[PDB]
Amino acid sequence: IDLGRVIGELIDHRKLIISITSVFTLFAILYALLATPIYETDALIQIEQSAPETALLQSRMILGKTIDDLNLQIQIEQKYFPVIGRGLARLMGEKPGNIDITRLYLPDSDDISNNTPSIILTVKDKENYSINSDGIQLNGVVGTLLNEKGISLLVNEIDAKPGDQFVITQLPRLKAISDLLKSFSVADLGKDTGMLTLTLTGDNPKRISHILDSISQNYLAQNIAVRIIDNAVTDPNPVRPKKTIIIVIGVVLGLIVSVVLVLFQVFLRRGIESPEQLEEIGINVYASIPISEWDTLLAVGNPADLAVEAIRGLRTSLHFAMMEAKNNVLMISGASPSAGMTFISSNLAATIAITGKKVLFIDADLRKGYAHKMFGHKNDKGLSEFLSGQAAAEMIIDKVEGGGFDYIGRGQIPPNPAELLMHPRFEQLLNWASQNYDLIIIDTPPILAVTDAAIIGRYAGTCLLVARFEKNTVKEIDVSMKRFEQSGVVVKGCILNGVVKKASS
Amino acid sequence: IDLGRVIGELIDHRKLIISITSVFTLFAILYALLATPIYETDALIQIEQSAPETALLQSRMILGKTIDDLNLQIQIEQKYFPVIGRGLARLMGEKPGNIDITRLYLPDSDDISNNTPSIILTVKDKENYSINSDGIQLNGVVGTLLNEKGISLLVNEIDAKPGDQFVITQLPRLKAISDLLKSFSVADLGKDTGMLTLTLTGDNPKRISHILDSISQNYLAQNIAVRIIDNAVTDPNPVRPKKTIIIVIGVVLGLIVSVVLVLFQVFLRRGIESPEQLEEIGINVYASIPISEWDTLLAVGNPADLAVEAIRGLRTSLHFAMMEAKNNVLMISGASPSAGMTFISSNLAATIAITGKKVLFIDADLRKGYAHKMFGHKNDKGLSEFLSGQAAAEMIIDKVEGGGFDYIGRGQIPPNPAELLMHPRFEQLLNWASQNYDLIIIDTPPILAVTDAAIIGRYAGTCLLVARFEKNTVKEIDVSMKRFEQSGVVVKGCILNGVVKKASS
Amino acid sequence: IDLGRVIGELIDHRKLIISITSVFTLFAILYALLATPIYETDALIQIEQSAPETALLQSRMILGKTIDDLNLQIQIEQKYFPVIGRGLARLMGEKPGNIDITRLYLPDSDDISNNTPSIILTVKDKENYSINSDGIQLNGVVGTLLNEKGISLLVNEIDAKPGDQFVITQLPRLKAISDLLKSFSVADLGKDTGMLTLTLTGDNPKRISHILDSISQNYLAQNIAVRIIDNAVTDPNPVRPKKTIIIVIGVVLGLIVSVVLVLFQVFLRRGIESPEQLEEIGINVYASIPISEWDTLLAVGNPADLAVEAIRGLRTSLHFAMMEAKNNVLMISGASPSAGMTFISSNLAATIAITGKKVLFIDADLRKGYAHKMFGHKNDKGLSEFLSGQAAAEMIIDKVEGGGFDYIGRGQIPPNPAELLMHPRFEQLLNWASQNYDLIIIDTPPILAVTDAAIIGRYAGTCLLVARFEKNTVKEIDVSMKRFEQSGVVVKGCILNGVVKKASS
Ligand SMILES: Nc1ncnc2c1ncn2[C@@H]1O[C@H](COP(=O)(O)OP(=O)(O)O)[C@@H](O)[C@H]1O
Ligand SMILES: Nc1ncnc2c1ncn2[C@@H]1O[C@H](COP(=O)(O)OP(=O)(O)O)[C@@H](O)[C@H]1O
Ligand SMILES: Nc1ncnc2c1ncn2[C@@H]1O[C@H](COP(=O)(O)OP(=O)(O)O)[C@@H](O)[C@H]1O
Ligand SMILES: [Mg+2]
Ligand SMILES: [Mg+2]
Ligand SMILES: [Mg+2]
């Protein structure tokens, strides 16, 4: 391999790479702007050791005393239905509300799994609110305590706009202790000094400072039955999410997945890339027709098309190739269907007729031939009707309107096309036509599908295959040439079709 | 090797890979959803050392005192007959029952092996129950103690639905101590502090907490004749089984075993893959007939079949190959039986007869020939009867009904087929037929099995072998060609049969 | 590869390398001369340990006491609108001013983000000043305190020229402590001694010394409720930016990016470099025309041009190549447009006419031919009008004024150029002209674009291609030669055009 090839492949697939990288970067930006910020508060205490004090601070007694003091077993969560509602509310500048609950007691269903009872509180005004646990609706008022339906609740100082909802959960004490212990860290920072740094992370910058102050005070009171140097304060810059590293990771991930996909697609290509691939085997490529981005003939609708220019190049190439041929019959065929045989044949006939030579076009695709549709037709009396014997040699020839050449349609689809094409009346037709016309072009089905082309090619002076640019492979074209030679038909060469411009070439 | 080949092999064997991986993932999911959950309880004590205390806690004195206190020597197990009954009961939400037994004394058979006596208790109601040890049925009532048949039992507070069964075992004290010590761990967690973490795992989240509390209290009482900071609590999330890692391991195991099986099958393939394998040796492959997924002729029942199209391709190839041959006799043969010789020969005769040429078909498989069954027959007067001399040249020829060609059946199976085929009357028959027909096709047995084909091939102008797609190998076909040439028979080429579409090609 | 090639490439691209390196060095010099200088002050104290004292010095209590003492929470910044205004002011020798503020209290909006209120103070004279916070204009006087609009301010000892502006921010206490702690360092320097080195970096050489003295005094007073050996002094040489290393890094970065760009451009070149590239394939290069840096003929305006000398070399080469040719017709063509076909053909005709031979020039570029513009024209009756039949063979020939040869213009642009060129009247014209002139030169469109050149080349005795020096590639020229040979036209050789002098050759 070489650098030029890889750079060309990257240039060709630029749209895919850009789209994938942009999608990944957009997802990264959305996550980094919608993820909830996490603040960190710190405190510094002095040990008058410090190896067992790390375990004493994280023991369930200290944390449990803190949780009992601060009522951390009442989980209040602002209610947003979607997974991005909270982030959108924060971005729009909306101020989150809060409720001070000093007493909560749910009926404690305590089944096998749901060990955490929860209710939903809807704020109707600054004073009253509605409560629903499992569809049971109740009404409560700030101030006076509520003892109804096995539910006890005391709510103070609602701070939210009316219509807001809050999920109130009474999680078990061990769950609260585990959650507190997950986000709480103790370090020595000197490995020998009495200095201990206590760290607590959480999404509420004031609550975490209060929690760490309570932890420190409880530990201090417990020890004297240690010195608090730095009481806990919260860093106003969140520690998570780290937006810049997230976005950089997203961009690099997009680039690497795009490069992997591009390499995978490049290594899985088998189609023909250039005429030199065919010419390595020993197949003369007589032309390369580009894609015409422009039920009518292109050589007639848009005579100045680039594809028609390539076809004129093919015409002047054939005027020299088709010399010293046994007759004036040219047979266009191919390996696979929808390669361009009818396009090539019809347009070539048009470009050769505009130069003043009489041209006959025969649609010998007795199976899926649509030439009569493209030329303007009387569908009666096609090639089939002549071959089966129910027509004459003069009632099957029609004239293209915007063309300048005659044509013979397929006719009705027969049940035995390959056996009709073997009748000697076909050779009689070709011998008769080879005296009233200057050129005869025959369109045929593929050869890798059926055998009609190989029957027709016996009476053809020149035979050319059509290879589609990306679809067909060199193996298919070689197999087709060999199958034609096995049946006694000499293929003059190939015609690459549907070519497009690639920066890797 | 190259990446395209391996990707193609993976695409071809996709069904096998998917099935194996799905089976493994289903087994992993069943195990991860039916395995009994194992909870873990923890405690934290303070050592006022700690290297000998780990051995003192795990000594048999502390554990034995705990087991005597909590009666851990009475093993009560809920009875489910299958190995998945307990998991199903847990999944369906069924609440396990329990019995508080404060005194159990079994007769203690104490033979060589069964040192653990056991009984089965069936719950009939909230009060009474039935007991069976070795077929001896007894009835007991909660409350009043039972002393019968050398069995002492005191049962309190049955909690289960009627009809439940419980296995009650009186395991030896050392066995109970060993079981307790297997699931009990002590750690320092600081390597220098007085802090010891005690861990106990078990399937009953309350019993393990009680057991660890008893262990801690016994150690504390023993030492003062240490401080308990964190009394034991149980983590409600089970530590085993870890479902996600189990499922990931199952999926990866399925993928690796599937890839290994695929590679093993690929490396053990010897059959013909493409016509190019035969053409490397120098054997002209004249056709490749695909599998016809559609006692009748295919070229007649379904004339538009893909296989009949391939046979028409072979027909037009033969019309050119069979020129400049010494006569109009074609001999289809093969290497191994059930390769397609009769299929190819009969269908080829049909496709050549539909074009208006007189065709004779001869079934020279005098050993296992079934052509007369496929054509509609009068089984008398076949080839055998003519060769042995008990028939004429005109009483053996019959006509295929839906065909269009004549045929000669094998006749009765003779005892000496290879010696009948050497009679000059066979050559007389062929010389006579070569003047009344346009083509003669002869079907023969394989050549690697018997020698009839090599006797017949002396009088055949053209001879073609049939190679089955996956079954035969290049070695078999080369051996067959060489064995034909050794006997003076020139094989024109080969016919690949039963071809299917493979993404690795 | 070899050293000579790389040295030549470096010599050829010297201007690009010099420009890039100079730009990078200029940017580095601008940064190193405009970046604000950062001074460093040091102190040395003695510890009578020293592992916890590093944490005690950086604790928020000591730094907070210092900040409360020195009022470091009032941030005063000199106002320069651009990002280089301060550096320019320092370079021009301007003395920065300062204000001593002993009391500041802003309304403290304290919204979600802007936690730091700020005002702008404009100095009108040595006594009074103007204040604007959010468009609210106020006037204040040094001395008397200001308590207006929720803003309290006390300003003493303004030292600046009138018209200067100062941003006054009241940043939060924790922000001030964090900023102080970011630039403050403590080290032991012996790892065992009581000697501690305290370091403080800042842009004001006196303020940092005062700050470090206050830090040391506060720590000393705190400890005795330690010895100060070296009170803080400021190194007058700034520690940042380090100009020399910055400039060296800039120069080396410029050199490496220039070398990378040069290597990238060299590896992405595909055009023809020397005639030997064409002669490897087997194409005879008959000349190499250099660029003429000098609507007129070069061989006439500047007959002593270097390009005209190369064309005379081509003329004497052709006088030997064009012997034993079937006629006296020469056809200049090419692969891509704007290669030099009309330049080469017209100048060659001029140089061959100055030697006394009758020369005919034909502009057979019926699509974009501008020869009549370059020769002085009567645009009527060109080649088109003759071919279409509406003109005679004598009304189309005109005479070049400063030339010496006749010419035929294209005429009006036709709709069917390629089909006009196929008329036998073109061959009649050439046969008639081949008897009244000594040489006929025909200019043609490219061959990779259209097919006109291949139609004309049938009647041309000699055909030469023109390859542009850097534009065309060897692949294009080979494709053109092969496409000419496919149509029955033998190309004698090639002509390299637009050559320039490269030190890598
Ligand atoms: N270079 C081309 N540019 C534009 N359209 C093309 C080109 N080649 C083929 N086609 C069009 O795509 C369709 C398939 O080609 P067609 O020749 O009709 O199939 P087949 O090769 O089986 O006879 C046709 O409608 C054709 O007009
Ligand atoms: N390409 C094929 N498609 C469908 N059936 C086939 C094909 N080739 C052979 N068979 C069928 O499978 C059976 C075995 O083939 P057969 O020719 O009868 O055996 P043998 O080669 O020994 O004479 C037959 O019943 C045949 O009809
Ligand atoms: N060696 C050259 N020196 C100076 N000018 C040149 C040279 N070669 C071509 N040109 C000029 O650059 C332009 C493009 O060349 P031209 O021959 O007219 O295009 P084309 O090859 O398509 O006919 C012209 O104006 C030509 O005069
Ligand atoms: Mg078609
Ligand atoms: Mg058989
Ligand atoms: Mg030009």
Q: CA torsion, points A6, A9, A14, A15, in degrees to nearest 10?
A: -150
Place of tokens 């936690």: C115
**CA neighbor of B481 nearest in space, from B325, B279, B283:** B283
Contact B66, B218 (CB under 8 A): yes
Counting as contact any 3 or more CB pairs under 8 A, the partners of B are A
Place of tokens 């206050």: C214
Contact B197, B44 (CB under 8 A): yes
Ramachandran region of residue B130, left (φ > 0), alpha (ψ -120 to 50) or beta?
beta
CA C172 to chain centre: 46
Place of tokens 């409350």: B143
Tokens of B105: 């004394």
Contact C278, C285 (CB under 8 A): yes
Q: How far is CA C256 from CA A91, C8, C18, C253, C485, in A?
A: 44, 17, 12, 5, 48
CA B223 to chain centre: 62
Contact A211, A218 (CB under 8 A): no
Q: State whether residue A325 sits within 8 Å of chain B by CB.
A: no
Residue A472: what are its φ and ψ, rounded to 5°?
-70, 160
Resolution in A: 2.6
In C354-443, which ranges are E strands?
359-363, 397-399, 406-408, 439-443
Supply the DSSP symbol for C458. Answer: G
Tokens of B18: 């998917």
Tokens of B505: 């090609």
Rounded distance between C-alpha atoms, residue B493 and residue B279, angstroms: 10
Amino acid at B350: A
B83: Cβ contacts below 8 Å, ≥ 6 apart: none
Supply the DSSP symbol for B227. Answer: E
Tokens of C230: 């070296």
Edge to edge, the sheet with strand A397-399 lists A285-290, A493-499, A462-468, A329-334, A439-443, A359-363, A406-408, A397-399
Rounded distance between C-alpha atoms, residue C375 and residue C399, angstroms: 8
Cα separation of the two ends of chain A: 13
Question: Rounded to 5 degrees, what angle do the CA atoms B34, B37, B43 make?
Answer: 175
Q: How far is the CA of A62 from the centre of ligand 2 (A)?
A: 85
Tokens of A288: 């390369």
Question: Rounded to 5 degrees, what angle do the CA atoms A463, A469, A475 make?
Answer: 70
Tokens of C346: 């017209």
Q: Output the ligand 2 site: residues, CB below 6 A.
A: B 289, 291-292, 307, 334, 337-343, 497-498
**CA neighbor of C504 nearest in space, from C9, C3, C14, C2:** C9
**CA neighbor of A44 nearest in space, from C215, C57, C69, C72:** C57
Cα dihedral across residues B75, B78, B82, B85: positive or negative: negative
Tokens of A499: 């070519």
Amino acid at B483: R
Q: How far is CA C442 from CA B280, C318, C365, in A?
A: 53, 15, 9
Contact A301, A351 (CB under 8 A): no
Q: How far is CA C317 from CA A53, C51, C158, in A?
A: 100, 93, 90
Q: Which helix (DSSP H) or strand (DSSP E) does residue B442 occupy?
A: strand B439-443
Cα dihedral across residues B46, B48, B50, B55: positive or negative: negative
* Residues within 5 A (CB) of ion ligand 4: A 341-342, 365
**CA neighbor of B345 nearest in space, from B301, B403, B390:** B403
**For residue A350, which residues of chain C lie inside 8 Å, CB to CB?**
none
Amino acid at B224: I
Tokens of A99: 């409720």
For residue B137, what are the β-bridge partners?
Answer: B132
Write out B23-73 in H/E/C secondary structure.
Answer: HHHHHHHHHHHHCCCEEEEEEEEECCCCHHHHHHHCCHHHHHHHHHHHCCC
**DSSP result, C207-241:** HHHHHHHHHHHHHHHHHT--EEEEEEEEEEEEEE-
Query: Cβ A317–C486 below 8 Å, yes or no?
Result: yes
Strand, coil or helix: B336: coil
Contact A482, A275 (CB under 8 A): no
In A256-337, which ranges are E strands?
285-290, 329-334
Rounded distance between C-alpha atoms, residue A454 and residue B309, angstroms: 13
**CA neighbor of A468 nearest in space, from A477, A481, A478, A456:** A477
Contact C335, C472 (CB under 8 A): yes
In A253-328, which ranges are E strands?
285-290
In ligand 1, which atom is closest to the CA atom of A343?
17
C46: Cβ contacts below 8 Å, ≥ 6 apart: C194, C195, C196, C226, C227, C228, C229
Residue A290: what are its φ and ψ, rounded to 5°?
-80, 165
**DSSP result, A148-160:** ETTEEEEEEEEES
Place of tokens 């500047």: C302
Mutate to test the pocket of ligand 1, among A306, A332, A338 (most ligand atoms within 8 A of CB): A338
Rounded distance between C-alpha atoms, residue C81 and residue B209, angstroms: 71
Tokens of A424: 């000697």
Long-range contacts of A239-248 (CB under 8 A, 24+ apart): A239/A38, A239/A39, A239/A40, A239/A201, A240/A35, A240/A37, A240/A38, A240/A201, A241/A31, A241/A32, A241/A35, A241/A37, A241/A38, A243/A32, A243/A33, A246/A28, A246/A31, A246/A32, A247/A25, A247/A28, A247/A29, A247/A32
Rounded distance between C-alpha atoms, residue A335 and residue A32, angstroms: 54
Tokens of A128: 């009253």
CA B243 to chain centre: 26
Q: How far is CA B265 from CA B1, B18, B244, B262, B502, in A?
A: 16, 16, 32, 5, 15
Contact C397, C408 (CB under 8 A): yes
Cα dihedral across residues A295, A300, A303, A306: positive or negative: positive
For residue B122, what are the β-bridge partners?
Answer: B130, B165
Residue A437: what are its φ and ψ, rounded to 5°?
-135, 160
Supply the DSSP symbol for A22. Answer: H
Amino acid at C232: A
A354: Cβ contacts below 8 Å, ≥ 6 apart: A299, A404, C416, C419
Contact C56, C5 (CB under 8 A): no
**DSSP result, C327-383:** SSEEEEEESSSSSSHHHHHHHHHHHHHTTT--EEEEE--TTT--HHHHH----SS-H
Rounded distance between C-alpha atoms, residue A346 and residue A365, angstroms: 13
Which residues 189-248 in chain B show a CB within 8 A of chain A?
189-190, 192-195, 229-230, 233, 235-236
> How many other CB atoms are found less than 10 A from the CB of residue B419?
11
Query: Cβ A309–C51 below 8 Å, yes or no?
Result: no
Contact B431, B326 (CB under 8 A): no
Rounded distance between C-alpha atoms, residue C417 and residue C70, angstroms: 92
Q: State whether residue A48 sits within 8 Å of chain C by CB.
A: no
Rounded distance between C-alpha atoms, residue B365 and residue B369, angstroms: 5
**CA neighbor of C443 nearest in space, from C356, C329, C352, C322:** C329
Rounded distance between C-alpha atoms, residue C296 and residue C305, angstroms: 14
For residue C131, what are the β-bridge partners?
Answer: C121, C138
Query: Residue A474: CA atoms inside 13 Å, Cβ hemisphere, count?
Result: 16
Considering only the beta carbons, identify the residue of C174, C415, C451 that sits closest to A313.
C451
Best mutation target among C416, C451, C456, C475 (most A Cβ atoms within 10 Å) is C451
Strand, coil or helix: C130: strand
Ramachandran region of residue A404, left (φ > 0), alpha (ψ -120 to 50) or beta?
left
Rounded distance between C-alpha atoms, residue A368 and residue C304, angstroms: 69
Contact A162, A170 (CB under 8 A): no
Rounded distance between C-alpha atoms, residue A469 and residue A271, angstroms: 7
> Which residues of C are part of a known binding site for Mg(2+)?
342, 365, 443
Strand, coil or helix: C164: coil
**CA neighbor of B406 nearest in space, from B432, B445, B367:** B432
Tokens of C339: 């290669």
Strand, coil or helix: C126: coil
> How many other CB atoms are found less than 10 A from the CB of residue C460?
25
CA C113 to chain centre: 40
Rounded distance between C-alpha atoms, residue A467 and residue C253, angstroms: 52
Method used to solve the structure = cryo-EM
**Strands A137-141, A128-132: parallel, antiparallel or unpaired by DSSP?**
antiparallel
Contact C454, C489 (CB under 8 A): yes
Residue B305 annotated as binding?
no
Contact B350, B297 (CB under 8 A): yes
**CA neighbor of B341 nearest in space, from B501, B418, B448, B429:** B448
A126: Cβ contacts below 8 Å, ≥ 6 apart: A142, A158, A162
CA A401 to chain centre: 46
Tokens of B403: 């065909």
* Residues within 5 A (CB) of ion ligand 6: C 341-342
C281: Cβ contacts below 8 Å, ≥ 6 apart: C474, C477, C478
